[PDB]
Amino acid sequence: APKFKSEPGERSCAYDGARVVLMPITDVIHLVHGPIACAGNSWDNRGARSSDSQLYRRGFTTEMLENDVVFGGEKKLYRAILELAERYEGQAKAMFVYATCVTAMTGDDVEAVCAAAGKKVAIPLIPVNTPGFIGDKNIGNRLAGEVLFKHVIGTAEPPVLGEYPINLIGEYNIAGDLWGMLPLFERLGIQVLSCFSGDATFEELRYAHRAKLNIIICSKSLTNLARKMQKNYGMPYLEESFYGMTDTAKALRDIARELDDAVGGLEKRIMQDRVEKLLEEEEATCRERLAPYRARLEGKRSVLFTGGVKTWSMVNALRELGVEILAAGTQNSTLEDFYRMKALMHQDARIIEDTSSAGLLQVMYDKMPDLIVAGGKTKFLALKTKTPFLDINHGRSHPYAGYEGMVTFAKQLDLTVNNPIWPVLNAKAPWEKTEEELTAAVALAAGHARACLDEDLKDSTVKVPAKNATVNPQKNSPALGATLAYLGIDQMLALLHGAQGCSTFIRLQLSRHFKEPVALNSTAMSEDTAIFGGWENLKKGLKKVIEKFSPEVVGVMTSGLTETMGDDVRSAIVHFRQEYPEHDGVPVVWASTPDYCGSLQEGYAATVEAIVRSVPEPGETIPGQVTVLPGAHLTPADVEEVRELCEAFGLDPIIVPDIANALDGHIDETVSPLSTGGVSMARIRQAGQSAATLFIGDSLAKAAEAMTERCGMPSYGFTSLTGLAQVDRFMETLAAIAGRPIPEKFRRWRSRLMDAMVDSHYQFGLKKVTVALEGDNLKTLVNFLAGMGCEIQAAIAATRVRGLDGLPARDIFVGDLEDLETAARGSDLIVANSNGRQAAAKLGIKAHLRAGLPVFDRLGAHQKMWVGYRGTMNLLFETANLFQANA
Amino acid sequence: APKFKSEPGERSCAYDGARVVLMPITDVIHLVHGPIACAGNSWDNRGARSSDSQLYRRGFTTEMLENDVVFGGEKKLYRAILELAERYEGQAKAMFVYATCVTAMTGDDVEAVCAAAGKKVAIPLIPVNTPGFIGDKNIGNRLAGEVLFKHVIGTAEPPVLGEYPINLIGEYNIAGDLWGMLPLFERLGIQVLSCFSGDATFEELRYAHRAKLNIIICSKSLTNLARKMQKNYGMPYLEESFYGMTDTAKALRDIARELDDAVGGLEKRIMQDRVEKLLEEEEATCRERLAPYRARLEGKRSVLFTGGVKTWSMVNALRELGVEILAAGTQNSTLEDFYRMKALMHQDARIIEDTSSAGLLQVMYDKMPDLIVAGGKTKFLALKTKTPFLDINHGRSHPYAGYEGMVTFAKQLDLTVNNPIWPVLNAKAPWEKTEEELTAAVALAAGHARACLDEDLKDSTVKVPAKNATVNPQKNSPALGATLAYLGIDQMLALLHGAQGCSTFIRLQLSRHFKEPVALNSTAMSEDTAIFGGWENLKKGLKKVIEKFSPEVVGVMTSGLTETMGDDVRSAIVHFRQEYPEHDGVPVVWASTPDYCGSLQEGYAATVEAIVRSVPEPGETIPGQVTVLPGAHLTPADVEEVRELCEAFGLDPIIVPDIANALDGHIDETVSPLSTGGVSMARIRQAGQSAATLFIGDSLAKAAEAMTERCGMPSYGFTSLTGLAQVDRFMETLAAIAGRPIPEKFRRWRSRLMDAMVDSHYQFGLKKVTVALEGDNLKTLVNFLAGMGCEIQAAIAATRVRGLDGLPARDIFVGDLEDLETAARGSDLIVANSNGRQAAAKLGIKAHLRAGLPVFDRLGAHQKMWVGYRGTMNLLFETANLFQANA
Ligand code: SF4
Ligand code: SF4
C-alpha cells in the first residue's frame, strides 16, 4: 500500500518527478541549475522517443562550482540562459529551468532570473521551481503539472481545430508507445489536440485549452492538472489506459460516449458506431495474430512489480495472454489504482507490501514464479535468481500499448520466457552433480567418437549438391588444410607435390588470413613431367629441399592432377630413401589430399591421420599426459587456451598439430625459411604414451580411432567447446582424467558466463540468423546461436559431414555463397567467412560475423578467441554488440 | 637476371597469367573449368577496382568432381555455360572460360564446347586455353594477349571516335591506379579508346582497332599484343610507365610527339604545347605538395624487390622523393627492363639474383636498409626483421601512379617509415637489457609517484574551463566513484549521506553500465532536515542499515548539499559509536566526495585514500606480498588480469578495492542486499604488511603516499599498462619485487604483440583521432594511439589533472561533449563514452570506440579487456577493425 515523509535507510527527488513530467517535451532546452549529480548522470536516460528535433535527448547543466556557491549562482544562470538562447536559435522554441537542492539551499530565485532574462530573449522561459528535497517524485509530478498549467496552457490558439479534439494527458511515449495508439485515433476521426509530455511540440502543447475531452493515462502524475483544467475550462476527464485489448476497447468506448455527449447528443451515435466497427475488425485481427503466442504462453506463473497505471492494465493484459499473477505489489501508484488491482487480483495471489530489495527477494523465493514482469530496479535482482524477466519501464525498448503494442508485448514475453537458455542455466552444476551423471557424461564423451563414425553418409536428409556452375565457393582446397596441419609442426616445411601453380593461392590465402609467412615449397611439374612418370620430380624436389633448407622432417601432400594420373607418393618415398641413404635421418610424412575429396576440414583431418599413423609409437602409459588433436576450426588462440585449460588441471598436454605457437604470429629473433614454433618431433613421438586422447572436432574422430587401436588409449570427443553445455562436458572429462576437482577460476568463469547469458538473451531472441561455414565451425555456431534463442534460417554447409541433419534449423543444405544470399533473405545476422561480404552488400545485412577461413578484411582473425567459458563469453558479447549496432 | 623451364624446390601457373591479364575485365563471367584449388582459393583476390557492374569480383567454378574426371567434364561445362547465361542475363556481356591442369589432362576441349554453346546463347564465349603446367605466368600472359587479339579486337566499331584516340595496354587499375591518370588524359584532349584489362567494359575493349597510338605500361604481359597490332593495323606502340613525375613527364611528352606525327605534322605543335603547359602547372603544384614529405623522407636507405615495370619507374620516383636504393632485384621482368634498372642503379648498389626467401633474407641482413619497397611475397618476411615496408603490388590498397598517385605514394612511404613504433620495437627487450637500465627503470617507476604529486596545477598550459552552460557533460559525480570503490569491498553496502534523490542516477547509472545490481542506500534528507542539524539522519540511517542488513562495515560518502551546509560526518560517526556501543564491531569508513570537487576519478581516489588511511595498520614485512590500488579507468577484467600477472611472478596480490570480483557480473547461489565479491576486511587489514605497493593510476599517487608513510613500503606507479612500453616497465618492477625472471608466457605474448603491431601499423598512420574521456583512461588511450602513428586532433579531458600538457596532441582542453563535436571535425575515430554517440550522429563519424564510463549501449563493457600484452593486442585489433570498417 502506498504511504505518501520517509524513513532513512524507493522514491527519488522532486527533480526526478519534474523531469519525468517535463523532459519528454522534444524541442525545448532542459537547463538544470545545479551540480553534476543532478543532470550529469541523468541526461539522455528517459525512455521517451520522438520524431522531431530531438533537442531533449541532450542535457544542459549550469555547473554549480566552488566560489559561486558561497557567492551566488544567479549570474551564472543568467549567462547560461543568454548563451543557450543565442547559440541554439532555430532549434529551441522554449526552455525549462529546474531548481535543485543546492540551488534551493543557496537561495537562488529561479523565477526572478527567468523574469529578468525573459525580456532579453525571444524564447519563453519556464521557471520550474521544484527543489529535490521537498518531497518524493509525486510532489515533483504535481509541481510540474502546476507549472505546465500556469505557464503553457492558454497562450496560443490552434491553427486547425478538428471538430473532435482530445488531449492525451500522462503519456510520455516510452519506446514508441504513442505511435501505437496514434494510428487508431485519427483513423476513427478524433484529433489529438495535445499529447502532454511526449513526442510533443511546445507550441503544440499550448493548444490544449481548446479541446472537449481529456484522456488521463497516468493518474499519478497529472491528475491535478486534469482536475484544474476541468475547474477552469469545463473539461471532463477520463481515466483509462491503453495497455491490453479489453482495457483499450473499454477506453475507446468510453471515449466515444464522452465525445458524443459534448458534441451533439447521444442520439445520432456517430462516434460509437465507428468505434465499434474499428474495435470489431482490429480485435478480430489482433486475436488471430495473438493465438500462436498464447499456446506457448499458457499457464505460466507471473509476478509483477510495476509502479504506475500499468499495474492495473497489465494484469488484465497478462490475464488475456494466458498467464496468472502470483504476487503483485506497487510502490508508485494511487490508492484507487491499488484497490482496483486488488479487485482484479485473484485469490491465492498475495499483494506484496515490502517494496525494498529484501522484500522482493522474499516474495521471489517464496512464490517461485516463472516470469516476473517488473521495474528497472528489480531488473537485475530477478535475473540473478535465473528466472525469465520482462521490463516494462523507461528502460524498455519496445512499444507495448495498443493492439500492435500488445502483439509486440506477447512477442517479447515469449522471447524472455521460452528461451532455451533457462533450462541450461537451471541445470545442475559440475561441482555438485553426483557421480553417476559424471560417469554417464564421461562415457558419452568417450563413445562420441564411435557415435560420429558409425553414422552413415547415405542416411542423411541433407541433400547432395547438384549444381553445375557454383559461384562464390566457400570451399577451399584440402591441400590448404594439409598445409595448415603441416605448419603446426616445429622446424618443418611442406612439400607440395603438385603443379607449381597450386603453391600460389594456397600460400597466398594462408598468408592473407594469418598475416604470417608460409613456406609451402612445391615440386614443379610441367606438361612433359605430367606424361610418362611424375615421381622423378618427387625425388628431385626432396633432394633439393633437404640439401637447401635441411629440414628434420618433410610433409608431402598431393594435388588434384597428381591424383588424376595417380602416381603413388610412397613408392617415390621409398625410392628416395634407398638411393640416398644419407637422408635416412629425415622422416617424411605423406598425405593424400586430392581436390575432389572435400574442403580444408577433410584435408586437415586426413593429414592429421597420416601424421598419427606414422610418427608416434606405443610405449608406456605415463599418467598425467593427454593428447589433443585440435580441429581445423579452432584459431591459434583457441588451441593456446585448450593448452591452458589442460594445464589448469595439472595435466601435461601434447597438441598435434601446434597451430597455437606457429601461425599465431610471433617475431622470433631470426627468420628461417622453414616453419618453426610447433611441436617438436620428440613430443609428437612421445605423444603415443598419453593416458587419454581428446579431439575437438567431429572430422577428427577417425584420427582418434587411428590412435585408439595403435596404442590403446581411450578417446574422448567434443564437437564444440562453446555454449556452457559442451564446456561443462569438457570439464567433466578433464576432471575424470586428472582425478582432481575443477579449480576455482573455472567456477568464477562459469558464473560470469551465466551473468553474460542472463544479461544478453534479450538481443538473441527470435533473430533470424543465417550461417554459411565449413563442416565444422558450423555445428558449433549453429548450436550456440540456436541454444540462445535465435532461429537459424539456413545452415549452409561447405561440404557434407556426419550429423548435419541434427542441427536446429529450417533447412540444411550444401551450397556456395550464392545459396547464402538466395537464402539469407529477411535475416539480420550472417555468420560466414570474409569472402561472403558481397552477399551482405547484396542484402543490406550490416551485421556480418567473420568466422572460419579465410578472414582477410578484419585484422586479428587468427587471435579470435571463442573457446572455453571465456571464449563463449567473448563470442556472446561480440554477437550481442553486432545485434545492437545493426539495429 | 630473369631466366625464363624451372627446377623443383616464384613463378605461378599459366592460369595465374591468364587471370592476371583477363580477370580485371569488369562485366564478364570468369568461369574456371577445374577443381577447387584453381578458383576456390583465388577469386576476389585481384587488386583491380572498377566503377562498373563489378561482376568480375565474384568467382565462377565448374567444380570438377570424382566421376566426371574418369567420364568427362565437357557436359558439365556445357551446363555451366547455359546456366550462367540464363541466370546472369543483363549483367554479363561476355564470359571467359579458363582451361586448367586437370581439364587439360582429362582432354577436355574448351574450344569445342565454346563453339557448341555459342549458337545457343547471345553472350560471346571466349575459350581461353591456357593449361597451368605449360609454363610460368609469362606464357599465360602471352596466351591471354593472343586470345584477346584473336577473339575481342576487331568486332565492333566505336560509337564515338575522338580525333586523338589512344589505347592503354597493360594497365590493370590496381587500387584506383587508372583513375589517377584518367583525369589527365581527357583534360589535355586525348581520348582513351580502350584501356586493356582494367576498369574496362568488354564492348569498350572491342573498340581498340580504331586508334592511332598504343601505350604499353607493363611490357612483360602484353608486348606481343602491341607488336601484333602494329603488324596488322599499322599501330605504333610506346613503352612507358606512369609511376613518378619525371617518368610521367617523359611519357606524356613522347605521347604528344607520337600523336602529332600521326595526325598532321610535327609542325603546328598542337599536342606538345598543351602537354607542356599542363606539365608545367601540375608539376609545380605537385612539387609544392611533395616538399613537406621529402624533409622527413630524406637520406633513408631503400631496397626494392618489385617484379614488373614498377622496378624501372619506382627507382626513379624514390630517387626524386629523396631516398637511394641499396639493392634491387626483380624476378618478373624483361631483360631490357633489368638492364635499364641496372643503368639507373647507382654504384654501391648490388643487384640481387637469388629471388628466393633465403636470398631475400641474406640481402636484408647484409645491406641493413631502413625501408623495403617489395612485393607481396616479401611482405611478411620483411616485417619480421622489424623494418619499415611498403607494398606495391596487387595487395596494395592505394593509388600510386600519376601526380596525385605520387603524392599518395609519398604519404604512404612517410606513414610506414616515420612510424613511432619502429624505435619501440627495435628497443632492447626486458629479458636481455643489462642491470643498470633495469635499476634505472625501477627507480623511475618508484619515483613516478612523487613526480606526479610534485607537478603543480598552476603551471599548466591546458586551460581552466570558463563555460557557463555546459551541454552533454561527460563528467560524473564523485559520489559515483565513491560508490564504485565501495562496491569493491566484500560484504558491505554504501550509505549515501545525501538527499535521497542523488541515490537515483548514481545506482541507476552504475546499474546500466555494469548490468549488475547496486545497493547504494541513502539517508533521506528533506527540507526540515536540511535546516537545523543534518547529523541526526546519519545516526538514524546507520542504525537502520545495521539493524536491517547487518553489514560488517559501512561506507559513508557525502553529496553536494551535505557539503553546502557543511556537516561533519565524523562527529556523527563518533556520536553513533558512543550512543550504541553494541555496534562497536562494525567499523565505518567516511570519505568526503563533494560534487564540485571533480568527476568519478577524483571521487574514486579520495575514497581509496580514506580507506587506506583508516583500515590497514602497519605490522611485519611478509615478503612476496604486493598491494595493488587499481584506478577508476580499469574495468573488472583489467583488475582480474592484474591479479593474474602478479600471481604469474609468484607474488601474492592484494587488490583494493576488488572490482574484478564484485562488479564483473557473477550469479552467486543466493542474492544478498549487500555488495559481495570484493576483498574481505581481513585482507584489507593485512595489506599494510606488503613488501611493495603498486598503483595503476596517476590520481592514485596520493593514495600511495598515504601508505608510504604509514607503513614504510616503497611505492611504484604506472600511468598506463598499454603500449608495450609501459607493460615492459611493469614487468621490470614485478621482476625486481619478486626477484625472479619473467616467465615464458609473457615473452610469447610480447612476441605476439610485436607481430600485431607490425601487421596493423598501416591503418594507424596519419589517422585523425579525437579522444574525450576522464583524467585517466585519456592519458592511456592518447599515449597508445599517438604511439602508433595516429595524431590526436583533440584530447578533451573531463577535468584538469596533473601532466595533461605532456600528451601528444594539437590542443588539450577541459570541456563537455559539445567541445567534442566542435573539435572532432574531419576526424575518423572518436574515443569517448557511450553518451557521446550523439556527437557521432552529428559528424557522421561511424567509428566510435566505447571507453570509460558509462557504456550502456554496448554489452560486455565491464569485461572489456585492455591490460597487459594481451589487452594491448585486443585494443589494437579492435581499433584496427574499426578503422577498416568505417573506411
Ligand atoms: S591445377 Fe594447374 S591451373 Fe590449377 S592452380 Fe594448380 S597449376 Fe594452376
Ligand atoms: S541534489 Fe537534490 S535534486 Fe539533485 S539529485 Fe540530489 S536530491 Fe535530486
PDB file of C-alpha atoms in Angstrom, chain A residues 5 8-13 16 36-37 41-45 57-63 66 76 79 83 87-88 133-134 365 377 380 384 467-468 470-473 475-477 500-501 504-509 511-512 515-516 522 525-527 544 595-596 640 660-661 664-665 667 671 748 752 755 759-760 763 818 835 837-838 857-859 863 870 873 881 884-885, chain B residues 5 8-13 16 36-37 41-45 57-63 66 76 79 83 87-88 133-134 365 377 380 384 467-468 470-473 475-477 500-501 504-509 511-512 515-516 522 525-527 544 595-596 640 660-661 664-665 667 671 748 752 755 759-760 763 818 835 837-838 857-859 863 870 873 881 884-885:
ATOM      1  CA  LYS A   5       7.746  11.833   4.587  1.00  0.00           C
ATOM      2  CA  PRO A   8      16.216   6.932   6.281  1.00  0.00           C
ATOM      3  CA  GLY A   9      17.579   3.602   5.104  1.00  0.00           C
ATOM      4  CA  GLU A  10      12.397   3.844  -3.494  1.00  0.00           C
ATOM      5  CA  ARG A  11      11.192   7.405  -4.094  1.00  0.00           C
ATOM      6  CA  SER A  12      13.612   9.738  -5.870  1.00  0.00           C
ATOM      7  CA  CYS A  13      13.949  13.510  -5.507  1.00  0.00           C
ATOM      8  CA  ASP A  16      13.120  13.323 -10.864  1.00  0.00           C
ATOM      9  CA  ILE A  36      26.827  17.401 -11.662  1.00  0.00           C
ATOM     10  CA  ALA A  37      24.832  14.778  -9.750  1.00  0.00           C
ATOM     11  CA  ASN A  41      24.430  11.226 -14.536  1.00  0.00           C
ATOM     12  CA  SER A  42      20.762  11.504 -15.564  1.00  0.00           C
ATOM     13  CA  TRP A  43      20.584  13.088 -19.031  1.00  0.00           C
ATOM     14  CA  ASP A  44      19.642  11.010 -22.090  1.00  0.00           C
ATOM     15  CA  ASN A  45      18.200   8.369 -19.752  1.00  0.00           C
ATOM     16  CA  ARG A  57      17.936  13.990 -25.522  1.00  0.00           C
ATOM     17  CA  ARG A  58      20.903  16.297 -24.850  1.00  0.00           C
ATOM     18  CA  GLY A  59      21.407  17.548 -21.298  1.00  0.00           C
ATOM     19  CA  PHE A  60      22.021  21.107 -20.114  1.00  0.00           C
ATOM     20  CA  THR A  61      23.693  21.950 -16.802  1.00  0.00           C
ATOM     21  CA  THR A  62      24.710  25.215 -15.150  1.00  0.00           C
ATOM     22  CA  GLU A  63      27.648  23.502 -13.352  1.00  0.00           C
ATOM     23  CA  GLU A  66      33.060  26.245  -5.539  1.00  0.00           C
ATOM     24  CA  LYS A  76      25.781  32.032 -13.912  1.00  0.00           C
ATOM     25  CA  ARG A  79      24.722  33.783 -18.667  1.00  0.00           C
ATOM     26  CA  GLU A  83      24.184  31.669 -24.308  1.00  0.00           C
ATOM     27  CA  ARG A  87      23.676  29.557 -29.782  1.00  0.00           C
ATOM     28  CA  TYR A  88      20.658  27.239 -30.143  1.00  0.00           C
ATOM     29  CA  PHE A 133      14.278  17.533  -1.037  1.00  0.00           C
ATOM     30  CA  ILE A 134      10.756  18.995  -0.768  1.00  0.00           C
ATOM     31  CA  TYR A 365      11.937 -17.090  -3.299  1.00  0.00           C
ATOM     32  CA  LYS A 377      15.098  -1.680 -10.020  1.00  0.00           C
ATOM     33  CA  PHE A 380      18.955  -7.460 -12.323  1.00  0.00           C
ATOM     34  CA  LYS A 384      20.287 -13.417 -10.603  1.00  0.00           C
ATOM     35  CA  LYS A 467      24.724 -27.592 -59.095  1.00  0.00           C
ATOM     36  CA  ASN A 468      26.814 -27.368 -62.247  1.00  0.00           C
ATOM     37  CA  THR A 470      28.916 -22.798 -58.460  1.00  0.00           C
ATOM     38  CA  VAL A 471      29.525 -19.089 -57.880  1.00  0.00           C
ATOM     39  CA  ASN A 472      31.467 -17.748 -54.887  1.00  0.00           C
ATOM     40  CA  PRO A 473      32.587 -21.116 -53.469  1.00  0.00           C
ATOM     41  CA  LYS A 475      35.084 -24.297 -50.013  1.00  0.00           C
ATOM     42  CA  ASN A 476      38.875 -24.364 -50.027  1.00  0.00           C
ATOM     43  CA  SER A 477      41.373 -26.900 -51.297  1.00  0.00           C
ATOM     44  CA  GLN A 500      53.887 -25.307 -59.086  1.00  0.00           C
ATOM     45  CA  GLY A 501      50.789 -23.151 -59.521  1.00  0.00           C
ATOM     46  CA  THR A 504      50.262 -19.964 -55.243  1.00  0.00           C
ATOM     47  CA  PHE A 505      46.684 -19.365 -53.972  1.00  0.00           C
ATOM     48  CA  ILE A 506      47.489 -21.789 -51.127  1.00  0.00           C
ATOM     49  CA  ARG A 507      50.474 -19.993 -49.623  1.00  0.00           C
ATOM     50  CA  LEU A 508      48.856 -16.685 -50.593  1.00  0.00           C
ATOM     51  CA  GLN A 509      45.487 -17.498 -48.992  1.00  0.00           C
ATOM     52  CA  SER A 511      49.358 -15.527 -45.791  1.00  0.00           C
ATOM     53  CA  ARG A 512      46.381 -13.198 -46.219  1.00  0.00           C
ATOM     54  CA  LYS A 515      49.148 -12.398 -41.815  1.00  0.00           C
ATOM     55  CA  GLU A 516      52.202 -14.658 -41.427  1.00  0.00           C
ATOM     56  CA  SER A 522      56.356 -27.255 -54.449  1.00  0.00           C
ATOM     57  CA  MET A 525      55.535 -30.331 -62.808  1.00  0.00           C
ATOM     58  CA  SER A 526      55.221 -29.265 -66.440  1.00  0.00           C
ATOM     59  CA  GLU A 527      53.464 -30.920 -69.377  1.00  0.00           C
ATOM     60  CA  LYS A 544      66.768 -30.119 -53.403  1.00  0.00           C
ATOM     61  CA  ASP A 595      40.995 -31.685 -54.572  1.00  0.00           C
ATOM     62  CA  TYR A 596      37.753 -33.574 -55.255  1.00  0.00           C
ATOM     63  CA  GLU A 640      46.500 -21.925 -26.777  1.00  0.00           C
ATOM     64  CA  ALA A 660      48.815 -22.028 -31.366  1.00  0.00           C
ATOM     65  CA  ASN A 661      52.574 -21.373 -31.446  1.00  0.00           C
ATOM     66  CA  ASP A 664      49.650 -17.260 -34.075  1.00  0.00           C
ATOM     67  CA  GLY A 665      52.133 -14.627 -35.233  1.00  0.00           C
ATOM     68  CA  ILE A 667      58.521 -12.146 -34.214  1.00  0.00           C
ATOM     69  CA  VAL A 671      63.628 -15.507 -39.695  1.00  0.00           C
ATOM     70  CA  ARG A 748      34.211 -17.985 -11.449  1.00  0.00           C
ATOM     71  CA  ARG A 752      30.481 -14.796 -15.338  1.00  0.00           C
ATOM     72  CA  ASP A 755      25.672 -13.489 -15.900  1.00  0.00           C
ATOM     73  CA  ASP A 759      22.003 -10.040 -19.393  1.00  0.00           C
ATOM     74  CA  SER A 760      22.193 -10.622 -23.167  1.00  0.00           C
ATOM     75  CA  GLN A 763      19.036  -9.497 -28.161  1.00  0.00           C
ATOM     76  CA  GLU A 818      25.047 -17.936 -53.902  1.00  0.00           C
ATOM     77  CA  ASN A 835      34.610 -13.551 -48.776  1.00  0.00           C
ATOM     78  CA  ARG A 837      30.857  -9.778 -47.624  1.00  0.00           C
ATOM     79  CA  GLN A 838      29.477  -9.343 -51.149  1.00  0.00           C
ATOM     80  CA  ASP A 857      39.416  -7.887 -44.264  1.00  0.00           C
ATOM     81  CA  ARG A 858      39.428  -7.988 -40.438  1.00  0.00           C
ATOM     82  CA  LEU A 859      42.709  -7.969 -38.543  1.00  0.00           C
ATOM     83  CA  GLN A 863      43.616 -14.307 -32.481  1.00  0.00           C
ATOM     84  CA  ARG A 870      35.826 -17.035 -21.527  1.00  0.00           C
ATOM     85  CA  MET A 873      31.556 -15.035 -23.201  1.00  0.00           C
ATOM     86  CA  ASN A 881      27.235  -5.977 -29.909  1.00  0.00           C
ATOM     87  CA  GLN A 884      22.825  -3.793 -31.071  1.00  0.00           C
ATOM     88  CA  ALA A 885      24.817  -1.975 -33.756  1.00  0.00           C
TER      89      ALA A 885
ATOM     90  CA  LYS B   5      61.615 -24.424 -67.586  1.00  0.00           C
ATOM     91  CA  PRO B   8      61.762 -28.296 -58.441  1.00  0.00           C
ATOM     92  CA  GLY B   9      62.208 -26.807 -54.989  1.00  0.00           C
ATOM     93  CA  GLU B  10      58.412 -17.910 -57.683  1.00  0.00           C
ATOM     94  CA  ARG B  11      56.530 -18.327 -60.966  1.00  0.00           C
ATOM     95  CA  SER B  12      52.901 -19.429 -60.712  1.00  0.00           C
ATOM     96  CA  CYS B  13      50.880 -21.487 -63.193  1.00  0.00           C
ATOM     97  CA  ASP B  16      47.631 -17.149 -62.964  1.00  0.00           C
ATOM     98  CA  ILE B  36      38.651 -26.040 -56.221  1.00  0.00           C
ATOM     99  CA  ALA B  37      42.348 -25.149 -55.992  1.00  0.00           C
ATOM    100  CA  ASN B  41      41.200 -20.018 -53.156  1.00  0.00           C
ATOM    101  CA  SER B  42      41.970 -17.346 -55.774  1.00  0.00           C
ATOM    102  CA  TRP B  43      38.747 -15.469 -56.583  1.00  0.00           C
ATOM    103  CA  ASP B  44      38.211 -11.886 -55.384  1.00  0.00           C
ATOM    104  CA  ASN B  45      41.967 -11.601 -54.810  1.00  0.00           C
ATOM    105  CA  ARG B  57      34.912  -9.770 -58.248  1.00  0.00           C
ATOM    106  CA  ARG B  58      32.754 -12.900 -57.903  1.00  0.00           C
ATOM    107  CA  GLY B  59      34.294 -16.232 -58.883  1.00  0.00           C
ATOM    108  CA  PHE B  60      32.840 -18.936 -61.125  1.00  0.00           C
ATOM    109  CA  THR B  61      33.920 -22.581 -60.974  1.00  0.00           C
ATOM    110  CA  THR B  62      32.777 -25.717 -62.785  1.00  0.00           C
ATOM    111  CA  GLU B  63      33.676 -27.911 -59.756  1.00  0.00           C
ATOM    112  CA  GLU B  66      35.143 -37.658 -58.916  1.00  0.00           C
ATOM    113  CA  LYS B  76      29.322 -30.108 -67.021  1.00  0.00           C
ATOM    114  CA  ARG B  79      25.505 -26.895 -68.400  1.00  0.00           C
ATOM    115  CA  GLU B  83      23.014 -21.697 -66.569  1.00  0.00           C
ATOM    116  CA  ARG B  87      20.623 -16.634 -64.740  1.00  0.00           C
ATOM    117  CA  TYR B  88      23.026 -13.691 -65.152  1.00  0.00           C
ATOM    118  CA  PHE B 133      51.577 -26.554 -66.373  1.00  0.00           C
ATOM    119  CA  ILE B 134      52.516 -25.387 -69.889  1.00  0.00           C
ATOM    120  CA  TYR B 365      70.533  -8.846 -43.211  1.00  0.00           C
ATOM    121  CA  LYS B 377      55.775 -12.451 -51.077  1.00  0.00           C
ATOM    122  CA  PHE B 380      55.702 -10.522 -44.015  1.00  0.00           C
ATOM    123  CA  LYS B 384      59.654  -9.944 -39.089  1.00  0.00           C
ATOM    124  CA  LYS B 467      31.932  27.935 -19.884  1.00  0.00           C
ATOM    125  CA  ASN B 468      28.680  28.894 -18.194  1.00  0.00           C
ATOM    126  CA  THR B 470      27.801  23.079 -20.443  1.00  0.00           C
ATOM    127  CA  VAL B 471      25.845  20.741 -22.718  1.00  0.00           C
ATOM    128  CA  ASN B 472      26.302  16.957 -22.692  1.00  0.00           C
ATOM    129  CA  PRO B 473      28.682  16.762 -19.708  1.00  0.00           C
ATOM    130  CA  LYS B 475      31.758  14.271 -16.154  1.00  0.00           C
ATOM    131  CA  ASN B 476      30.090  12.176 -13.469  1.00  0.00           C
ATOM    132  CA  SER B 477      29.517  12.753  -9.779  1.00  0.00           C
ATOM    133  CA  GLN B 500      17.608  10.544  -1.228  1.00  0.00           C
ATOM    134  CA  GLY B 501      17.479  11.673  -4.854  1.00  0.00           C
ATOM    135  CA  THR B 504      18.895   7.581  -8.013  1.00  0.00           C
ATOM    136  CA  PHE B 505      21.042   8.438 -11.084  1.00  0.00           C
ATOM    137  CA  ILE B 506      24.024   7.008  -9.166  1.00  0.00           C
ATOM    138  CA  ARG B 507      22.724   3.496  -8.550  1.00  0.00           C
ATOM    139  CA  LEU B 508      20.912   3.680 -11.894  1.00  0.00           C
ATOM    140  CA  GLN B 509      23.989   4.790 -13.862  1.00  0.00           C
ATOM    141  CA  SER B 511      23.374  -0.496 -12.967  1.00  0.00           C
ATOM    142  CA  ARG B 512      23.097   0.487 -16.632  1.00  0.00           C
ATOM    143  CA  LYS B 515      24.472  -4.528 -15.827  1.00  0.00           C
ATOM    144  CA  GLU B 516      24.647  -5.556 -12.154  1.00  0.00           C
ATOM    145  CA  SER B 522      20.824   6.704   1.285  1.00  0.00           C
ATOM    146  CA  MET B 525      17.111  14.396   3.940  1.00  0.00           C
ATOM    147  CA  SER B 526      14.126  16.688   3.424  1.00  0.00           C
ATOM    148  CA  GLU B 527      13.802  20.462   3.742  1.00  0.00           C
ATOM    149  CA  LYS B 544      18.506   1.329  10.419  1.00  0.00           C
ATOM    150  CA  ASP B 595      30.102  17.327  -6.244  1.00  0.00           C
ATOM    151  CA  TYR B 596      32.140  20.442  -7.075  1.00  0.00           C
ATOM    152  CA  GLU B 640      41.471  -9.612 -12.813  1.00  0.00           C
ATOM    153  CA  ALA B 660      37.303  -7.622 -10.555  1.00  0.00           C
ATOM    154  CA  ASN B 661      35.198  -9.961  -8.395  1.00  0.00           C
ATOM    155  CA  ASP B 664      32.364  -8.212 -13.009  1.00  0.00           C
ATOM    156  CA  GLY B 665      28.966  -9.914 -13.001  1.00  0.00           C
ATOM    157  CA  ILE B 667      25.421 -15.290 -10.444  1.00  0.00           C
ATOM    158  CA  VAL B 671      21.218 -12.849  -3.827  1.00  0.00           C
ATOM    159  CA  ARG B 748      55.407 -15.229 -26.070  1.00  0.00           C
ATOM    160  CA  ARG B 752      52.578 -11.739 -30.432  1.00  0.00           C
ATOM    161  CA  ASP B 755      53.602  -9.194 -34.629  1.00  0.00           C
ATOM    162  CA  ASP B 759      50.874  -6.131 -39.183  1.00  0.00           C
ATOM    163  CA  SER B 760      48.494  -3.319 -38.165  1.00  0.00           C
ATOM    164  CA  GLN B 763      45.801   1.512 -40.529  1.00  0.00           C
ATOM    165  CA  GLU B 818      29.964  19.953 -27.146  1.00  0.00           C
ATOM    166  CA  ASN B 835      26.783   9.071 -24.245  1.00  0.00           C
ATOM    167  CA  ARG B 837      27.140   8.755 -29.669  1.00  0.00           C
ATOM    168  CA  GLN B 838      25.061  11.841 -30.494  1.00  0.00           C
ATOM    169  CA  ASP B 857      24.584   0.754 -25.478  1.00  0.00           C
ATOM    170  CA  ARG B 858      27.295  -1.917 -25.879  1.00  0.00           C
ATOM    171  CA  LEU B 859      27.134  -5.113 -23.849  1.00  0.00           C
ATOM    172  CA  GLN B 863      34.509  -7.206 -19.494  1.00  0.00           C
ATOM    173  CA  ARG B 870      47.144  -9.411 -24.354  1.00  0.00           C
ATOM    174  CA  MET B 873      46.765  -6.678 -28.528  1.00  0.00           C
ATOM    175  CA  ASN B 881      38.937  -3.368 -37.101  1.00  0.00           C
ATOM    176  CA  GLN B 884      38.873  -0.997 -41.566  1.00  0.00           C
ATOM    177  CA  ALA B 885      35.092  -0.994 -41.132  1.00  0.00           C
TER     178      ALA B 885
END
